[PDB]
Each structure stands twice: as C-alpha cells, then as structure tokens.
Amino acid sequence: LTPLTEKDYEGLKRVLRSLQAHKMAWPFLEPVDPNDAPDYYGVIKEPMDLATMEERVQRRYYEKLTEFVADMTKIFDNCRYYNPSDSPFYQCAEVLESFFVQKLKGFK
Numbered sequence: 001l002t003p004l005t006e007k008d009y010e011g012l013k014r015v016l017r018s019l020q021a022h023k024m025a026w027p028f029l030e031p032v033d034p035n036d037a038p039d040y041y042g043v044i045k046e047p048m049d050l051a052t053m054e055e056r057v058q059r060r061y062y063e064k065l066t067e068f069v070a071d072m073t074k075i076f077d078n079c080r081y082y083n084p085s086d087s088p089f090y091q092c093a094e095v096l097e098s099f100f101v102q103k104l105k106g107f108k
C-alpha cells in the first residue's frame with residue numbers, strides 16, 4: 001500500500017478534527033474514565049480513542065492509511081461490544097462511523 005505522505009497527513013488531521021467536532025463524538029474524545037466504568041478495561045483488550053489517535057498522527061505513527069483506519073475501527077468495535085445496541089453510547093458509534101466513512105471516502 002501507498003505510504004502516507006506529508007500531504008496525506010494534512011488530510012488525516014482534517015479528518016480527525018472533523019470527527020472530534022462531531023456532536024456525537026463525546027464518548028470517544030478521550031480514554032474511557034475507569035472511574036465511570038470500573039469493568040471497562042477488563043472487558044476491552046485494546047482500548048482506543050480520538051486523543052490517542054491525535055497523538056499518533058502528531059508523532060507520524062501511521063505509515064499506511066490502513067493502520068489509521070484500523071485504529072478508528074477499534075473505537076467503534078470496542079463501543080458496540082461494550083454497550084448494548086439500545087445504549088446512547090452505541091448510537092454514537094453508529095452515527096460517527098457512518099460519518100467517518102463519508103470523510104474517509106473523500107480523503108481517499
């Protein structure tokens with residue numbers, strides 16, 4: 001696959017900022033607070049959140065788009081596994097993942 005260029009990285013920053021600004025993004029902005037879900041980190045093996053992804057973008061951690069998409073998909077998969085399908089948290093993953101897909105297609 002094609003390495004992420006400096007120009008690609010500016011696009012990833014734009015995509016990440018779009019997700020961080022979405023009104024349904026709140027549960028994903030930062031790592032789950034263990035005090036608000038004391039079982040969360042025993043349930044979810046590989047936590048992920050948008051602030052961790054922002055740190056990784058700023059550090060040029062990602063070499064291929066597939067790696068960035070994989071971290072984003074972890075956010076949504078973790079949410080749907082931890083929460084029941086009628087939870088407001090689950091709803092956020094449904095909305096934000098479709099929004100991410102729209103933005104990802106534009107990024108290409």
Ligand SMILES: CNc1cc(-c2ccc3[nH]ccc3c2)nc(S(C)(=O)=O)n1
Binds near residue numbers: 028030078079080083
């Ligand atoms: C009750 N279920 C939950 C609770 C939370 C949660 C709680 C407190 C929090 N403080 C800072 C982030 C943060 C996230 N996040 C989810 S999530 C990421 O959508 O799977 N599900």
